[PDB]
Amino acid sequence: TFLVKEDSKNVTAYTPFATPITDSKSDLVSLAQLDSSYQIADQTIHNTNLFVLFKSRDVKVKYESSGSNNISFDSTSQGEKPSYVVEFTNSTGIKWTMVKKYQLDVPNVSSDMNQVLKNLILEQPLTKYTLNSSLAKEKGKTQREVHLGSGQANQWTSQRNQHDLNNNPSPNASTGFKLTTGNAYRKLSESWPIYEPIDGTKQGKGKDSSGWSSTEENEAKNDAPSVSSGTFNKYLNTKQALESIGILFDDQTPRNVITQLYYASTSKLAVTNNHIVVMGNSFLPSMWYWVVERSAQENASNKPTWFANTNLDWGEDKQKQFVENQLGYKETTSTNSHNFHSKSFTQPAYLISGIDSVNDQIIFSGFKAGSVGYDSSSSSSSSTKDQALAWSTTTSLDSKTGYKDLVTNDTGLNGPINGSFSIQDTFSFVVPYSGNHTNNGTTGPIKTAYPVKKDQKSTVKINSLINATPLNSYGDEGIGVFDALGLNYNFKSNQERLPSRTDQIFVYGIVSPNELRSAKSSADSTGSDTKVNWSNTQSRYLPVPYNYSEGIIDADGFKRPENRGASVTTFSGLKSIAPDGFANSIANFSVGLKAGIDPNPVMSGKKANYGAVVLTRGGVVRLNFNPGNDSLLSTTDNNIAPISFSFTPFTAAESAVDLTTFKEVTYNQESGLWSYIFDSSLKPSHDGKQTPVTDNMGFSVITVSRTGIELNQDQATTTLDVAPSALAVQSGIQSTTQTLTGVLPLSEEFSAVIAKDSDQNKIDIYKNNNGLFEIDT
């Protein structure tokens, strides 16, 4: 029998004949002995029992920079509503009864962690209505402007050696983006605004919470009023959009960053034979995750593990350093120059695609949320004051071809180097040279350095920030756009896309029960921050489709003259033509990670195959694993890109689907097919211009199938050299009128759709032809 979620707290069971079981509508929130403010966040089936995640709309969390126990629930005003994971069972018809109830307590904080948190600042979440221009921030100081000062041009050649930028050919390379304007950056105790600038290069107060609350917020309220009578020339009102992505409010005002971080961090559920795993959502970053031992006592506090303590394998040692060297500045010749890199932490947040389990293994994926240092000096003063220190790390044109050599390239490892370079009859934004290489021949090794002057080394305060997108540098320049859309190509006979290693990074992997026990120990460590190691992980540069932006039509080394023009080179300039329910065409999104075991037989004496699929902006990604080792699939040749990742573009039908309305991902074990359910009723009621939405009705379903030569099929396929892929195709189940309840996969050859057009229910039976549906009236 199949289970259907009637609403935010009720669950109704159906027989395989698409008929509802009488007296089966159960209120699990009531059953779990939880109050009205709670609703079911995620459901999964393990060991035949239903595991349910619950989260309260009434949760309140505080961050107190002083003290030992910094992150805590606000007991005082009935905000001590932690999230719960409950095991339910059938005691027979359908009669649910609670087995175990686990509570997810806030994270513990060390002395070292709290020194980052004290001055940690966070970007306002990205919305359905957020533009390329809202995201855009004013360009920072030039490399020669930081280390040398103003009017120090054509003196670079003689002075670059002292500042340890020996032979560096890019004085004009940007050092980051200014934080005095653009999208709001807030402390964990501070709250985010309902307003978003239309142009971040001009409108906005960035990290200046004080300057916003005193003067700018009032201009914002006047321009972009809630419900319209408003002008909407400088600002967008996204209260409705914010609310639709899980933002909690005190009427009009959103709750502080820490509360939003908690509520969104308890979004997805995975269950193994000994552990329960809880991760965040795709909308806003997750700085932690929960590993709950299923053997935990009735009233015990289950604490999360920080991502800043979970050391991942980025594929290569160099790939990890790239991410870390940009997290902040080291040495701390100041005293309060605390950031993540200095306090010896790793990547602190991820925008989680999802989490699932196969053969007691946990599978995760997501994009790495951008994180960089920033200056907070407050005065003469430092040249980098009120600015983020981020840069492009895209592989140089002169680099060796072959995946391993492209990703290990020392281009932009310690400091910035990319810009704009004229090559023959075209151009590039990536530095043409690395090592001893120059146009004349060999000139001595090229050096890079963190954008901090060595004279101002002591009188500088480099603290930490976290972005709401997979973009590290938002500085309004050429290279920013090519790194975001994947428009950097080499010029050698065999073309190759030069990857970035900090911007639009997709991280994925498989976690063992012992790797999860390690994670649990780190959450329970008191005193020192205990470090975790996840071995079977990988990273891949996954950018947004270039054709989602107006003005770009191909991806080649040769670039047309019109493509050096400002209108299609900077963020504010760039215009979106993306149909996937996002106003921006620059930041990538991922959702619906679901793994499944292949029904097709494998060679005798070999373990059954299993993979995972996930949806990203522009296509479907497939994660390939070796079942004999329960590791990521790999191959002998390093020149070929990790065979554990595959990407297949979408067509106009799949691109048309609003990725922000993802409801549920299912997998049919007998078919080997994934059903991606999108409910249009998950749309916000009003635009950024407060105009009522008129397309929040209906649904859509996408089928995902395995393609390619699969492992251990025969004697030849015992090893692979090509990554097996996936295919996303609009199933044929869709509506613009009906409001979906759920989809019953009645059989391999049949499916049932439960919906309401005018309150009364309707059961639609569709004919299934290996993933392709046509209605049976």
Side-chain angles (χ1 to χ4, degrees):
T1 70
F2 317 101
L3 292 157
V4 171
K5 216 157 86 190
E6 295 290 304
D7 57 270
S8 73
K9 3 185 113 152
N10 290 277
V11 169
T12 300
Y14 285 73
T15 59
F17 270 75
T19 69
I21 299 158
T22 335
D23 298 323
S24 68
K25 181 190 161 82
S26 306
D27 181 10
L28 302 175
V29 169
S30 147
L31 235 114
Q33 296 191 264
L34 293 168
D35 63 88
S36 52
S37 71
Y38 283 89
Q39 67 248 293
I40 144 157
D42 208 2
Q43 13 62 234
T44 198
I45 297 281
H46 188 91
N47 58 247
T48 79
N49 294 3
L50 173 74
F51 288 82
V52 182
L53 221 205
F54 300 94
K55 51 181 189 172
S56 161
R57 273 175 284 106
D58 247 79
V59 72
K60 297 162 194 171
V61 190
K62 321 164 286 186
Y63 169 66
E64 289 295 85
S65 49
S66 62
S68 314
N69 317 135
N70 311 89
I71 298 168
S72 52
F73 295 106
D74 188 25
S75 310
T76 70
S77 278
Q78 271 14 306
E80 201 148 23
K81 269 123 193 305
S83 278
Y84 288 82
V85 165
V86 182
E87 191 174 346
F88 290 101
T89 195
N90 180 50
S91 46
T92 309
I94 289 299
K95 194 242 277 170
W96 292 108
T97 151
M98 173 171 83
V99 177
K100 295 192 208 72
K101 179 167 165 191
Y102 313 89
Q103 102 146 64
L104 326 169
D105 206 26
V106 286
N108 54 150
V109 187
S110 80
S111 316
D112 295 74
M113 182 66 82
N114 197 54
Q115 283 183 341
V116 197
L117 295 188
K118 200 157 50 70
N119 321 274
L120 181 72
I121 239 94
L122 268 110
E123 217 213 340
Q124 65 172 113
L126 178 113
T127 269
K128 200 185 190 295
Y129 303 111
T130 306
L131 320 148
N132 294 347
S133 46
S134 305
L135 261 2
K137 279 142 194 113
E138 44 192 30
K139 209 177 164 296
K141 289 268 179 77
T142 238
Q143 192 142 225
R144 87 168 145 206
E145 271 151 48
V146 164
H147 301 86
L148 297 240
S150 178
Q152 299 277 274
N154 71 87
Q155 212 192 294
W156 170 256
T157 285
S158 306
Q159 290 264 266
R160 67 179 162 189
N161 329 70
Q162 22 260 93
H163 296 87
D164 294 339
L165 291 151
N166 292 251
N167 293 93
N168 194 313
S170 310
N172 296 318
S174 203
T175 62
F177 55 103
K178 304 188 229 164
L179 297 183
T180 30
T181 24
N183 267 231
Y185 277 102
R186 297 286 178 264
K187 291 223 155 177
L188 299 156
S189 38
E190 280 170 7
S191 175
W192 283 313
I194 60 157
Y195 312 93
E196 195 151 37
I198 285 155
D199 189 60
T201 6
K202 297 227 160 311
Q203 325 299 338
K205 281 292 153 188
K207 71 179 178 64
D208 188 21
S209 62
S210 194
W212 170 261
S213 81
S214 77
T215 340
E216 202 56 18
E217 189 177 70
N218 202 73
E219 260 61 83
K221 193 183 185 178
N222 198 282
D223 176 276
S226 264
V227 60
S228 195
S229 54
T231 162
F232 301 92
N233 274 324
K234 320 270 201 187
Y235 290 99
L236 288 180
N237 200 274
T238 58
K239 195 208 169 279
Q240 295 90 341
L242 254 16
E243 213 174 328
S244 84
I245 74 159
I247 300 284
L248 293 177
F249 296 90
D250 300 308
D251 220 300
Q252 281 294 312
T253 293
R255 275 160 201 171
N256 60 16
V257 184
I258 199 89
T259 309
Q260 298 305 162
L261 248 52
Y262 181 74
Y263 189 79
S265 68
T266 70
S267 294
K268 296 283 164 275
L269 176 71
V271 187
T272 145
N273 278 339
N274 314 106
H275 297 94
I276 284 172
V277 191
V278 169
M279 285 188 159
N281 61 51
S282 311
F283 302 119
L284 52 143
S286 338
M287 315 202 299
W288 56 85
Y289 58 99
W290 279 270
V291 176
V292 177
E293 212 77 36
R294 290 177 64 187
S295 61
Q297 268 192 82
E298 218 174 280
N299 281 255
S301 131
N302 305 285
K303 306 200 78 70
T305 318
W306 293 86
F307 277 118
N309 289 328
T310 323
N311 295 308
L312 311 181
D313 188 305
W314 291 77
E316 304 283 329
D317 232 308
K318 208 115 265 186
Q319 291 184 268
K320 199 184 199 223
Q321 288 153 51
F322 263 91
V323 174
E324 272 158 17
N325 289 12
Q326 211 165 117
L327 290 170
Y329 187 60
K330 267 269 251 281
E331 189 54 81
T332 79
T333 18
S334 179
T335 183
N336 265 244
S337 178
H338 307 291
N339 62 75
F340 283 113
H341 184 208
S342 69
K343 288 270 103 175
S344 211
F345 287 95
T346 189
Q347 174 61 47
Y350 294 89
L351 286 132
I352 304 299
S353 260
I355 194 146
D356 195 28
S357 52
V358 255
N359 304 304
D360 248 35
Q361 306 288 290
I362 256 80
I363 289 168
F364 77 96
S365 69
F367 270 96
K368 152 257 201 280
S371 180
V372 302
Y374 76 93
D375 206 342
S376 48
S377 291
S378 297
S379 183
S380 54
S381 64
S382 63
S383 29
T384 52
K385 225 220 116 178
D386 301 329
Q387 186 203 294
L389 316 149
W391 58 86
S392 180
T393 62
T394 298
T395 305
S396 60
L397 303 179
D398 79 307
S399 165
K400 298 176 168 75
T401 57
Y403 191 90
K404 196 205 164 146
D405 298 78
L406 287 178
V407 300
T408 102
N409 198 266
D410 275 27
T411 296
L413 172 70
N414 314 302
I417 187 108
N418 298 152
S420 190
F421 301 86
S422 283
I423 302 141
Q424 293 314 285
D425 68 333
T426 196
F427 67 94
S428 79
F429 293 152
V430 154
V431 73
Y433 299 120
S434 69
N436 297 77
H437 298 175
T438 65
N439 193 228
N440 313 59
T442 83
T443 67
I446 307 154
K447 285 172 112 192
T448 35
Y450 204 92
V452 165
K453 196 176 169 145
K454 59 212 296 280
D455 304 63
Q456 308 178 123
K457 201 193 184 191
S458 36
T459 50
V460 83
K461 202 180 171 231
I462 305 317
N463 302 132
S464 261
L465 68 77
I466 310 176
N467 306 327
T469 79
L471 299 158
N472 250 49
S473 198
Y474 289 109
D476 192 44
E477 81 210 70
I479 187 70
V481 165
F482 284 24
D483 281 18
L485 302 159
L487 292 165
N488 290 306
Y489 282 79
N490 66 359
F491 292 91
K492 286 170 184 190
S493 62
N494 294 330
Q495 287 267 118
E496 283 237 72
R497 199 227 272 144
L498 304 159
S500 172
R501 13 264 169 91
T502 51
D503 283 79
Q504 307 256 59
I505 305 312
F506 185 76
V507 182
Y508 63 91
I510 188 161
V511 189
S512 85
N514 297 316
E515 289 187 331
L516 288 169
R517 285 179 190 101
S518 317
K520 186 57 171 181
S521 306
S522 173
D524 302 322
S525 49
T526 49
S528 289
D529 274 312
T530 288
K531 266 67 178 164
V532 207
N533 294 98
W534 291 358
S535 326
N536 299 310
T537 76
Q538 258 285 178
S539 86
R540 182 74 113 262
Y541 168 63
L542 176 60
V544 278
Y546 59 98
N547 70 314
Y548 268 20
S549 309
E550 184 182 83
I552 306 118
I553 56 157
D554 64 359
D556 197 89
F558 180 87
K559 299 266 161 44
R560 282 165 255 260
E562 48 264 39
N563 301 280
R564 214 184 187 163
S567 60
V568 74
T569 262
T570 69
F571 282 119
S572 50
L574 198 69
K575 194 215 164 191
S576 159
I577 55 140
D580 65 0
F582 279 110
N584 69 94
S585 60
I586 57 157
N588 213 334
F589 176 90
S590 58
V591 84
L593 176 80
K594 184 89 175 70
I597 299 151
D598 193 349
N600 286 308
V602 84
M603 201 188 175
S604 182
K606 292 289 184 183
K607 258 184 75 201
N609 263 307
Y610 61 95
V613 298
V614 49
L615 288 192
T616 54
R617 292 188 83 174
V620 58
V621 11
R622 168 135 188 231
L623 315 184
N624 316 301
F625 311 97
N626 175 213
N629 216 218
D630 294 310
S631 59
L632 302 171
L633 192 78
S634 19
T635 184
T636 317
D637 200 353
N638 300 129
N639 289 296
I640 103 114
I643 205 190
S644 47
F645 180 102
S646 192
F647 176 93
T648 299
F650 277 162
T651 113
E654 303 81 50
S655 289
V657 181
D658 185 353
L659 290 164
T660 74
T661 77
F662 167 73
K663 195 199 191 180
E664 212 185 61
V665 58
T666 40
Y667 179 78
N668 193 319
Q669 315 214 305
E670 1 239 290
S671 274
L673 298 169
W674 290 265
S675 308
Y676 280 81
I677 320 300
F678 296 83
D679 181 51
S680 316
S681 295
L682 284 158
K683 267 170 176 285
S685 205
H686 306 273
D687 297 16
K689 278 159 158 90
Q690 293 296 273
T691 59
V693 159
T694 60
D695 73 338
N696 49 210
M697 296 203 75
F699 51 91
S700 188
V701 173
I702 298 189
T703 298
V704 179
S705 58
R706 290 178 168 89
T707 68
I709 343 272
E710 313 291 330
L711 192 75
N712 300 138
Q713 286 300 300
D714 63 89
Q715 191 80 287
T717 46
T718 62
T719 61
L720 298 164
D721 48 297
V722 180
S725 56
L727 171 69
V729 156
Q730 211 289 325
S731 72
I733 306 167
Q734 68 235 68
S735 205
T736 49
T737 50
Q738 293 155 33
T739 287
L740 175 76
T741 322
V743 177
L744 313 174
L746 249 46
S747 82
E748 272 200 66
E749 193 92 310
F750 278 104
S751 268
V753 180
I754 309 138
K756 302 100 173 180
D757 36 37
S758 154
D759 207 313
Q760 89 290 248
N761 289 60
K762 198 191 192 282
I763 306 149
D764 281 13
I765 283 169
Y766 287 77
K767 237 264 108 231
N768 182 34
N769 323 278
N770 22 258
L772 299 113
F773 304 84
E774 67 172 59
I775 177 89
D776 181 17
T777 41

